[model samples]
Target: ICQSGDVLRARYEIVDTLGEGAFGKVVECIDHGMDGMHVAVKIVKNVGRYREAARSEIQVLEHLNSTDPNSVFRCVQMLEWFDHHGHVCIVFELLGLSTYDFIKENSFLPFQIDHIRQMAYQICQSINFLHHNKLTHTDLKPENILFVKSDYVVKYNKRDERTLKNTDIKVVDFGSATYDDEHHSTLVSTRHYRAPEVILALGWSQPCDVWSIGCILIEYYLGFTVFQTHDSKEHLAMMERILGPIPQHMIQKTRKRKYFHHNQLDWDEHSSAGRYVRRRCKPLKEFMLCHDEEHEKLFDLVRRMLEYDPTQRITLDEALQHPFFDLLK
Candidate 1:
């Protein structure tokens, strides 16, 4: 029922649609209550399920806003929330394209290592903050991490490229956020970013979020997902192909028995899926964007984060302390 020029609460006037999906739509608006400041309003569908989802999102946002009112932790700041007729509208400070959008628009060229370092450190720190609060983002990916501003300048070094003027980012989308003490979903995260423990049905906690962060970091450094697969079996196969075998302990304990044959990944190397994984993936070290001391540090940190065993996976705090981030400090 909302459209351009329609004013909600007699204060916020919609200007244009920013995005749309099954959850609902986000629109850019001008806030007369704050000297016509620009803002983003996420309007959820009137459906009961979606309304409930928005309520939980508001709960997470309110918690973050209260504890970090200034957004020192770099989580997106929510301006306010209200019900406009049938829609549950949540307002937030306007932000730019998600990291995924930026990378895609930039011809899929990987980010400079230094830029990757800067962005990764901030994301880890913010997610670490979430973890310490007993919250697991459950779904962490490039699309959920957005730049505060996407302003860029053209770089004409042989190939034209756009370099971001400001690499500052804030994590967004808390709809899937869950407290450690709450019920754990059977699955979380997008397929490309799902952790091994989650696919294994071993049940997950904060460590699962760390694995998603590691996957995201690889996508940032390579401009694409490292574990590119749709099926859970293939997803696990890709992980093993790139990161090495799934630990015997994990394989032995997994509830996903179909994926294993005699305690090894039940995958056929000669099948179409297996052949594709073989061609598309290599040892994790082989995917290094560059070879240097700094690169070594980055991969070393990632390796720990990508550990097959959730118990051995790096904690976000420990990840922040990894030498890969020494320069950042």
Candidate 2:
């Protein structure tokens, strides 16, 4: 509800609104209380549900900030939080555009392998730190990964291209972050990036985040979403085509019996939807952009993350040490 120049708490002078979502609007503000520092203030809606969610988010942010004051783990730093009348406001260090936005703005050009390596390393480091502290960021996608500074330079390889100055990033939007002692939601993560275990209703933990990370890595490499489906059945089919068949043990355990027959994924392979999935997805290894050692290592890491069984999925700490990130270290 604040317009440009509107001051909040007689300190943060609103510059402009950055973005808006179901939670509320995020506005760029100049913090007079902090030597005119530019910051982003997430103004939560006055609705009770949203307000309480914001309150919970503030607790998580504060905990993360205190643990890594210097933000060495690449987690976004929260400066402070307060209530602006009926709205809950959380102030954070103003970061650059999200990875999703930049990818779209650049005509969805795939990020260079080197860039992906650096960004993935930082992301895993941040999430690994959260896992270390018994926190699980239920949402981890390109939209939640923001560049620290997105000032890019234009280049032409016959085709005009925008290359980011640096691959540094920070993980944000911990609204759904769950601590070990917190209640776990049955469903988490965006549809495209959701882990198979989540869709099967088999329960999830930190491995779910790693699954989303696998999806994000593929998106960054392909310049488009890899698992592009809205229906759970089709999503499973696509995963089967790409990653291989779901383990029979997992199939036996899932309560969603409608999706399976005799412990096998029940689907008409000749249906239009089946044909679409087949056409859109190939084996995961076949999707590799290159056949070099680096690409091979990356695919290996992705394969580990995209494991159908959550128990076998790669931990963020192990992902950090993946050979794909050796050069980054």
Candidate 3:
């Protein structure tokens, strides 16, 4: 129940509110007795079982800090975590503005292909790190990424280019992330970035994040989400519209899963539109033909990521080795 300006762990002092989330409020804070250090302390109120979720987040962050230290956004350091008066206070490095805000402010400026490729390369590297460690970033979107600089640093900027760093691109928010195993859950990512396997209610793995990355890459290029479905039914319909119907193989896979039975029945036996839409949907190849030639490589990468069959989706390692990033140093 830290209202405002409360000091916790006997060091960190809350300055002002940064933002609020479903679980808690993020406050901009400063370390007392230590100069030139800033941190964001996330104060969460104990609401039912949310304490376990916070503990899980802390555990995952600790694991990430140890296992894949060089990946995208490094956790930097976990300052402290403690339960104060039934409220949990978790402090982390104050990363910069999210990629979502960056894109919003710079919406008028067209993104250069090289810059996009560089970002893709960094993200691929991070994803490769996660997958190699058997972990999955279930939630992959722009909001979780941070910008390295205050000003837009073009990839080809001669003076600032040499010293520019790609390692600043870090991925945060592991609350929804989980290790891939037999006990993995289903449909965990945000709707717009969610994979088809999730939409169809089929069991998923790290490839789910690949699908999300594809959606994000497209959004970066197009300046908006490619598929904006209203609900599960509409999501499937939208996928059908863009990538054609779910192939028989994908349908069979979906139908075989216990969780997917309802969606399968609704899609196959109930919805007249689903049946017709799946039959007449356009292919990814066709969709790409309508976009700009400058985006060919990006489109290729997105297509691979958006594969309807999770089994066919590109693995993080394979994606890192793709020719899209081979052009980079």
Candidate 4:
């Protein structure tokens, strides 16, 4: 809620608003001590939930910062943090556009396959580091990632540097991140990106992070959300269409599992009163515009990450080895 020109601790001067969420508003600011260095500042509201969310986020970021630099390089570097006017504000290195914003500007058309490949690879690496450290990014999605710099005005037909260096991304918004080994949240992730286990209250771990990135990568590849229904049953139908059946054993484990009663007929038989909706299903091909070898490999990688069985799903380490990133190799 701080206006442009407001100064924090007489050092960082607010420049402009970036974005806002239930937690708080993030503003672009100029660090006076660094000769007008631009930095992103997250100002948490003084309300109850936002306050605790900020504190939790700081703790997680602190953990990352205390780790050895040789062991990680894909995180947003926190510059400073302090409290003021009953609000907790964090200063961070400025990053460029988010994939969400980038896609909107591209009219939701797919990015170059090579670009998507590199982006997906880095995502796997970053999240892998988190899971490696016992943390899980419970709310990973398009909006949570920002480019290392502003959009490269020129799109090189080839890789970022004939490719040793890849497009770097800063994973932001740790307010929803939690320990994989800790108590579980009731549910996590955006609806479309949410895993079946989360929806079923089966509990989750690091693999849920893999599931979320799968949906995000697919969206970047196809220019739309892979599964887009708002209704639970319809979403389940969409999942079944692309991912095949929800393993029977998993169905038996959670009555809360969507679209089932130990059989598909109940979900197929009745439609919700307010929504348009599932039946046997469709295949993944219907969602992909191209089945070229590159995209085929990409599809395979997504499938592995999106495995319906969290227990059997690919871990972040395993996903980094997939051929979709061969260009990176």
Candidate 5:
């Protein structure tokens, strides 16, 4: 039997608990024999339901490590799977604060356009890598992105200022993620970032990630969440206001699904849906006036990615080729 504070592996010494979620607890630790290198150990409780999910996540991470090592965010570097006393421990590189914290602290200051572009490019590259590997990161949000410290030091005007440079953005928390082929149900992502297909409970795919990217991109631009709603229905209404109504074809497809059959009128007879459809007929500028011409390219990309029809949503590769990132090349 494993004790509460037992160190299963001699190399890792668990120091203190960091946090806990629906999955399990995260702990801060130090590698004993590796020059005391710090690492975060995610200990997943080996319960019956969670065991399968944990194993799948581990397998996916292992596959990603073997294939795309240079992708934006990465999985645990040195992973050790343990079955000691019916528990599993996944070890990974310890990183700094999440993008959520970064935004929270710096919400007042408008982000520099160059920095936003670079971040978009990095995030798009990561999504592209996942798409190439036939995986769907169903949950892509600010909280999942972790930032690391930089090793470089800069001297500006004889003043020693240590600014974080070339730090890797690590994407973590795959509890809600799934492989493309293994996609089963809907309602996968967080409420604000969820795509229209997910909301309608219709079939969904990698395009869902694109929708999430669009939402996150807008949030990054505005320094706040765009879709502020109290419930799912209200959230759907808010989506309609922004991206326009769900297409009739999409509604028809959703009616066939079990979860969507109950709320058929919500899509069919909703007055807001019709109003939103008419609103989209006008130029996008009428709605989002906060952006100028140069930045309009970014807004255009977000619009296409957040399309109601999942089939019509922009793919990651197509998004990369968009002119918004063209300036980068």
Candidate 6:
């Protein structure tokens, strides 16, 4: 409920509403007492659960800021935080449009191959660094991966260099981040990139993030979510068709029985589940990637990341070392 122009701590002045989610509202602000220095403040909605999520987020960010200063990961740093009435307001360095926005601005066409490659590689470095610190970003999507726009408005003669590669990027939204000790929320990610383990309620950890990044990088190439469905059952059905049957061992759990019974979908007769048929997964050639070694390597990398069984999925280190990332450092 925090609005633009509201001032907290008598120092930071809100300039605009950046975004809002179940956890809280985020606003762009200027430090009135510090020459209008810009900052982003995430104001937790005045509710107990949201306040708890805010506290966890602040703790994670503060710990990372203090311990990982020299880390090469690209992510927004927490500057400070404070309480206002019943709301916990945390401040961070401001960043620019997310990959989501970049897609929108360009009419939703897929990004150029080189652009996707550079962004994907940079993201790998960041995600690997997070895993090294025993952290997992439960929420990894285009909206959280923002492009840090160029500050220089100077004209350039170089045409090809106009790509997003020259600019650094940062990941935001750590409310769902958890220490390797597993988690704060079992169902933490956006539905589009939700890992099979999370959807099926099989406990999750770092590989959950790997699954998410796989969906994210593919979205960067295809211009949309790989498994696109608003309903959970449909989402699962889509995953089954594409990622291969969600693994019999993974599908045999009890809580999972809520959706699947006897290793098959168990929907009510009249439920929408019947409307969704498990179609054959299309070939990799159906995508924009060409029939080349580099493209095949990229596809292989994504396949391992999107593996249904969390235990079998590629680890963050292995993903970073994949031949597809050889061009990156």
| Of 2 and 5, the candidate ranking higher by TM-score | 2
lDDT tens per residue, model 6, 83-172: 999989998888787888777765575766667678887787788888888899888999999888734233344222234535467888
lDDT of 1 by residue, 1-329 (tens): 68999998889999999889888899999999999999999999899999988899899999999888999899999989999998999999999999999999999988999999999989998998898888999989999999999999998885889999999999999999999888888989988989898988899999998889889888988888888878999988899888888899998898789998999988898998889999989999999866999999999988898998888888987888889988977
Q: How many backbone clashes does candidate 4 have?
A: 0
Best of the two (3, 4) by lDDT: 4
lDDT of prediction 3: 0.71
Model 3, 251-322: lDDT tens per residue? 676644532443443355237656555554556566443455546666777788888888888887788777
lDDT of 6 at 278: 31
Which pairs clash in model 1? Answer: none
Winner by TM-score between candidate 5 and candidate 1? 1
Q: After superposition, how far is residue 210 of candidate 1 from its true place, in Å?
A: 0.6
How far residue 300's Cα lies from its native spot in candidate 3, in Å, is: 0.9
Ranking by TM-score: 1, 2, 4, 6, 3, 5
TM-scores of the candidates in the order shown? 0.97, 0.97, 0.82, 0.90, 0.81, 0.87
Expressed as tens digits, the lDDT of each residue in 58-170 for candidate 5 is 88777777786654445435356666566678887787766666667543333455556777777888877788877788899877776764243454643444334654566
| lDDT score for residue 72 of model 3 | 45
lDDT of 2: 0.91
Please state every model's RMSD to the true fold in angstroms: 1.1, 1.3, 5.5, 4.0, 5.6, 4.0
Q: After superposition, how far is residue 193 of candidate 4 from its true place, in Å?
A: 1.1
Reference-based TM-score, model 4: 0.90
Instruction: Summarize candidate 4's per-residue lDDT along 149-245 as a digit string, tens digits.
Output: 7545534563321221335687887777888667778878888889988887788888888999988988887777767667776677777767887
Residue 95's C-alpha lDDT in candidate 3?
72
